[PDB]
Design a protein around this nucleic acid. Structure first.
Lengths: 437, 50, 53, 159, 133, 257
RNA sequence: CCUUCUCAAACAUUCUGUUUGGUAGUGAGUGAUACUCUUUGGAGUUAACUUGAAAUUGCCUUAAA
């Protein structure tokens, strides 16, 4: 089927055309009509299978049907376990609403609380917020208009339960209304606890729908960027995909690499969907180049036959990253080597790697030979305002992602050396980041 | 870590604008026949004093 | 309104150094002494063009 | 006697270290009114008939220096030991120590003012230095640290 | 306790024994001053040892020059414990090559070179590389 | 001249040796890839250990392939130009690029003796800056002052040591003189030092560089010049301290001892 | 707390082309096997790399007073 065969408003149709997706996916084709009808639906759709747009489009349709002013109510609420997923969903919502006149915003853990409170007071008709900060905004912020909750959707309930927000989810359900609220949810899988949570939230009888060496390098925090740059320079003429934990960091790294006179491609949620698809196709068909992508962007995206898979930043979903290699080896003609960067304080991930029992190899590099571009990077940052701002934004995003990592036992902000990270980013003086240390 | 972020302004990474304003004011004064350029002053004084 | 002679000359250098590629002009250290945004540069170029060829 | 915070001053640098610091600072004298005025007039004259790098100067304003500190931008800070409103400078050494910015106490505010074309400068600090003097700046920082923090480690004790 | 022998490092280039003796002679009298030097080249290693007749002079010199800045070098001076007498320190100077091994006749070394070339060919053959002449 | 068959056999043996049956290229990519020829002589320039460099004429110097192949390496090839203080103001980077971009060569930076003594005085900074560039060109006038300003560490290697380049025409500085002398050095010369010892070595570059036949021609051309220059002795083509492959055998030199 | 040996000729005078000469250095440490040499003791050459200018001993008077 196609989006043209649905009762979609003209601005929504124009936005969908701007996205570039005209053929409905199986999950989308099966979920969009029931969602538009208002029936509660839950499923085990895999992440990145287009379910995000699948349940976003009905929300926009409901908003366009009600046509209530931004001051009237809060409209739709979206809960996601991770900050990166929240940013991706907000970007998708903004892309879809470009034509639409409704308001949208985010509430992300570790962000400016005052700004989020002001935005909520102004009125947001499409809110995407993590449960941890969503509870705080619901409880200790006067003027919130959550009383008009029309729809509620939960993404990746299994991850939310695993992190430990089940009590937070119960509190949110208790606080939020249930009179006219239509409840839905989606996740890669669903356990007994997830089923109980769905039963608690989903008011009616919900509709059910179903559808290699672990190479790692131990490098210092300050020298990680230089080592990655040297690896890319000496591995040129190949195809390499780099995984990061922040879209801002990906954009900054891509811009810096382009400025250093070496072609590089970026793939982040903040990029326009049409531009995202064009860049992905160009990288796939080029047969040579380097792609810098975020974890969430490549979570469900197709993986061409790439020679290397580099996990520069800690994975957002450790289990998915651990299990990826098994299928990645079979899915590529030439088994793409997997590379991971581990801080000396991040050696705890070796315990999980051993628990996986997959083959592993410890690569080594000489400290004598390195790109040695620290002085040039510092001069460029101190001389260029745009590059300085991009680097600062990337550093802030990386710190925020690190602080929000579920694996607290392996990753901790306290153990991190801020000075070394700033030097790697090119800042002799680490810019301040509002991290709840 | 420092105390306050205070994102840096462009003026820190950009040449001073007050200096440009003063230079433009001096240019306007010279054009209006109000300020003698230093070279003109030197030329006039060289003829003078003798 | 009108643009100053110095501003017009600087815009002429931007034009016959990069043309219409505002992205490249954004990184022009020699001509773009002030690191202005792409939007401001494009607006100034359009204003200059409206009064010229 | 006086409390530990008082008498922390007057334990200035030795003759050689102070002389070297002042010699280094004399290479970054901010342009006086006449120098800046003549430079601006020359620039105007050039513009009349038809890209310089960032200027380097010593930052000395008390408010400006205090703003520079607590942001780790400053590298060396000079503190006058004869400030009549002592409260204006009592907190500077401890704040610098907390921020880790190297600091020193020099004799006389007029000496600081002379190197900045001012009658009296409460403080004098350096933020950025030329690549030529970067090694010299590091050497002076190390010498000041050795001669002040270790030699006068008890400056914050024994009332 | 501490002895009169003093160890000084971080000596600026050109700060030779004579200059050290002249500068330290003010503090009482110095028994002997020695500066480390390289054998092939006569330049100093930027560290030497000096002995004082009296321990008070040694301690005064150590206090005065503990962290003295000397044209880019912060001199560090230490007073060794009781004993630890200075060892030998040759006054090395520049070494100039002298040629002496040309006494062998040219005829003998011709055959020696031929034999060495044959042995080299045999060795490179033994190394897994096939070559001739 | 020596038959080309021996040189062909030597290069084929080197090619065989380069391939044999832990991520970055520490020393392996340079040990079994470097090509050099060892020339023996009776105390090359025994009178004095001057740092003079001899620019052997080469039809196809490795500089162009070195720049072409330097992209896929951590170390980036660069060219350093050193000129006197008086002539640096006249020399402009834009003019040099415009007059040299046609040939394809580029100049990364231009330096003067004043800069070396003020900004690069520090030993650490001097070492960091010098190591960046692989090709160093210095005005004939300032080469005598360079060793004092730049120290002796840069002279420990052929790449780091300066190379004399003419920049004066009719006793007056001429832009075209430098513009074409740099081209001649880049694509028509091969610098090599003259050590104060019996052994002399010339670095011919990596194995993946100019084709073996071109490598053989370059070796023959270098050997002819060396024979015409000094009373050289047995010559061997050697990889990084790998088995030596003799190429020339001189006997009349021994009788002259 | 001073600064560093910033060119000389022959031919050609297409205004720059050919040939020659002038370059004696912070030290320490690590380190890839060839050259001769005199026979002994090692003398000079030969890849590569770290460094805060780092470091424990190789048997003339006016910057006058």
């Amino acid at each position: 089927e196609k989006f043209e065969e649905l009762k979609l408003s003209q601005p929504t149709l124009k936005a969908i055309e701007k996205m570039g997706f005209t053929t409905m996916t199986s999950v989308q084709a099966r979920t969009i009509p029931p969602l538009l009808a208002g029936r509660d639906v839950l499923g085990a759709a895999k992440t990145g299978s287009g379910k995000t747009l699948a349940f976003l489009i009905p929300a926009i349709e409901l908003l366009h049907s009600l046509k209530f002013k931004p001051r009237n109510g809060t409209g739709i609420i979206v809960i996601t376990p991770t900050r990166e997923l929240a940013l991706q969903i907000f970007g998708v919502a903004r892309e879809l609403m470009e034509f639409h006149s409704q308001t949208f915003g985010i509430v992300i853990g570790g962000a400016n609380r005052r700004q989020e409170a002001e935005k909520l007071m102004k009125g947001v008709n499409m809110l995407i917020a993590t449960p941890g900060r969503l509870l705080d905004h619901l409880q200790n912020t006067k003027g919130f208009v959550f009383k008009n909750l029309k729809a509620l959707i939960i993404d990746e309930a299994d991850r939310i339960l695993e992190i430990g927000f089940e009590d937070e989810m119960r509190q949110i359900i208790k606080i939020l209304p249930n009179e006219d609220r239509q409840s839905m949810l989606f996740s890669a899988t669903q356990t007994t606890k997830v089923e109980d949570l769905a039963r608690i939230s989903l008011r009616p009888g919900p509709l059910f729908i179903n559808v290699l060496e672990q190479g790692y390098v131990v490098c210092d925090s300050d020298k990680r960027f230089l080592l990655l740059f040297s690896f890319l320079k000496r591995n040129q003429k190949k195809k390499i995909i780099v995984f990061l934990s922040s879209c801002n960091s990906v954009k900054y790294y891509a811009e810096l690499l382009n400025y250093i006179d070496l072609p590089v491609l970026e793939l982040h949620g903040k990029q326009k969907q049409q531009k995202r698809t064009n860049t992905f196709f160009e990288f796939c068909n080029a047969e040579r180049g380097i792609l810098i992508c975020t974890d969430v962007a490549a979570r469900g995206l197709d993986i061409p036959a790439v020679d290397w898979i580099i996990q520069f930043d800690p994975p957002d979903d450790p289990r998915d990253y651990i299990h990826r290699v098994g299928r990645t080896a079979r899915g590529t003609k030439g088994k793409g080597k997997s590379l991971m960067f581990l801080t000396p304080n991040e050696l705890g991930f070796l315990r999980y790697l051993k628990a996986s029992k997959v083959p592993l190899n410890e690569y080594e590099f000489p400290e004598n030979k390195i790109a040695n571009v620290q002085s040039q990077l510092e001069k460029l940052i101190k001389s260029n305002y745009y590059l300085h701002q991009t680097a600062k934004d990337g550093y802030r995003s990386y710190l925020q992602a690190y602080a929000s990592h579920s694996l607290k036992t392996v990753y901790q902000i306290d153990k991190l050396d801020l000075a070394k990270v700033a030097k790697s980013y090119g800042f002799p003086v680490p810019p301040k980041v509002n991290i709840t240390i | 870590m420092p105390l306050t972020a205070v994102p840096e302004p462009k003026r820190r990474f950009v040449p001073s604008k007050n200096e440009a304003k003063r230079v433009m004011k001096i240019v306007r004064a010279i054009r209006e026949g109000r300020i003698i350029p230093p070279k003109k002053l030197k030329e006039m004084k060289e003829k003078e004093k003798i | 309104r009108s643009q100053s002679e110095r501003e017009e000359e600087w815009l002429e250098k931007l034009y016959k150094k990069h043309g219409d590629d505002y992205k490249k002009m954004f990184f022009d250290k020699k001509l773009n002494i002030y690191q202005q945004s792409e939007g401001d540069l494009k607006r100034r170029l359009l204003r200059w063009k409206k009064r010229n060829g | 006697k006086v409390p530990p915070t008082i008498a922390q001053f007057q334990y200035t640098l030795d003759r050689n270290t102070a002389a070297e610091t002042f010699k280094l600072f004399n290479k970054y004298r901010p342009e006086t009114a006449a120098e800046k005025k003549e430079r601006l007039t020359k620039e105007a004259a050039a513009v009349a008939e038809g890209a310089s790098p960032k200027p380097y100067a010593v930052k000395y304003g008390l408010n400006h220096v205090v703003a520079l500190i607590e942001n780790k931008k400053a590298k060396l800070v000079l503190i006058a030991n004869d400030v009549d409103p002592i409260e204006l400078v009592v907190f500077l050494p401890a704040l610098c120590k907390k921020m880790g910015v190297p600091y020193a106490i020099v004799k006389g505010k007029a000496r600081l003012g002379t190197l900045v074309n001012q009658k009296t400068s409460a403080v004098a600090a350096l933020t950025e230095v030329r690549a030529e003097d970067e090694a010299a700046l590091a050497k002076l920082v190390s010498t000041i640290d050795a001669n002040f923090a270790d030699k006068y480690d008890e400056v914050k004790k024994h009332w | 306790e501490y002895s009169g022998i003093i160890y000084v490092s971080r000596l600026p280039h050109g700060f030779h024994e004579k200059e050290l003796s002249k500068y330290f002679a003010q503090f009482g009298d110095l028994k002997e001053v020695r500066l480390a030097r390289n054998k092939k080249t006569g330049n100093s290693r930027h560290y030497g040892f000096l002995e004082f007749v009296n321990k008070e002079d040694a301690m005064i010199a150590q206090e005065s020059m503990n962290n003295y800045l000397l044209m880019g070098h912060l001199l560090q001076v230490r007073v060794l414990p009781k004993g630890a007498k200075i060892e030998k320190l040759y006054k090395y100077k520049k070494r100039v090559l002298v040629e002496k091994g040309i006494t062998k006749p040219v005829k003998q070394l011709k055959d020696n070179m031929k034999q060495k070339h044959e042995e080299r060919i045999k060795k490179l053959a033994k190394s897994g590389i096939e070559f001739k002449w | 001249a020596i038959p080309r068959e021996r040189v062909i056999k030597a290069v084929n043996e080197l090619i065989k040796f380069t391939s044999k049956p832990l991520l970055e290229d520490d020393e392996e990519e340079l040990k079994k890839d470097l090509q050099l020829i060892v020339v023996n002589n009776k105390s090359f320039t025994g009178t004095s250990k001057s740092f003079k460099l001899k620019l052997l004429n080469v039809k196809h110097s490795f500089y162009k392939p070195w720049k072409e192949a330097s992209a896929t390496a951590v170390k980036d090839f660069k060219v350093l130009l050193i000129l006197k203080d008086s002539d640096i103001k006249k020399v402009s980077e834009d003019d040099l690029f415009d007059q040299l971009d046609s040939e394809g060569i580029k100049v990364d930076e231009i330096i003067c003796g004043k800069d070396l003594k003020t900004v690069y005085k520090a030993y650490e900074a001097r070492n960091a800056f010098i190591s960046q560039f692989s090709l160093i060109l210095a005005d004939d006038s300032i080469v005598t002052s360079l060793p004092k300003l730049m120290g002796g560490k840069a002279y420990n290697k052929v790449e780091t040591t300066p190379i004399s380049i003419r920049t004066h025409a009719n006793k007056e500085f001429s832009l075209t003189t430098l513009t074409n002398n740099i081209k001649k050095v880049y694509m028509n010369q091969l610098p090599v030092k003259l050590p104060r010892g019996t052994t002399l070595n010339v670095h011919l570059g990596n194995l993946e560089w100019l084709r073996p036949e071109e490598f053989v021609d370059n070796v023959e051309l270098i050997s002819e010049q060396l024979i015409k220059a000094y009373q050289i002795r047995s010559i061997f083509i050697k990889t990084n301290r790998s088995p030596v492959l003799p190429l020339y055998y001189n006997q009349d030199v021994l009788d002259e001892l």
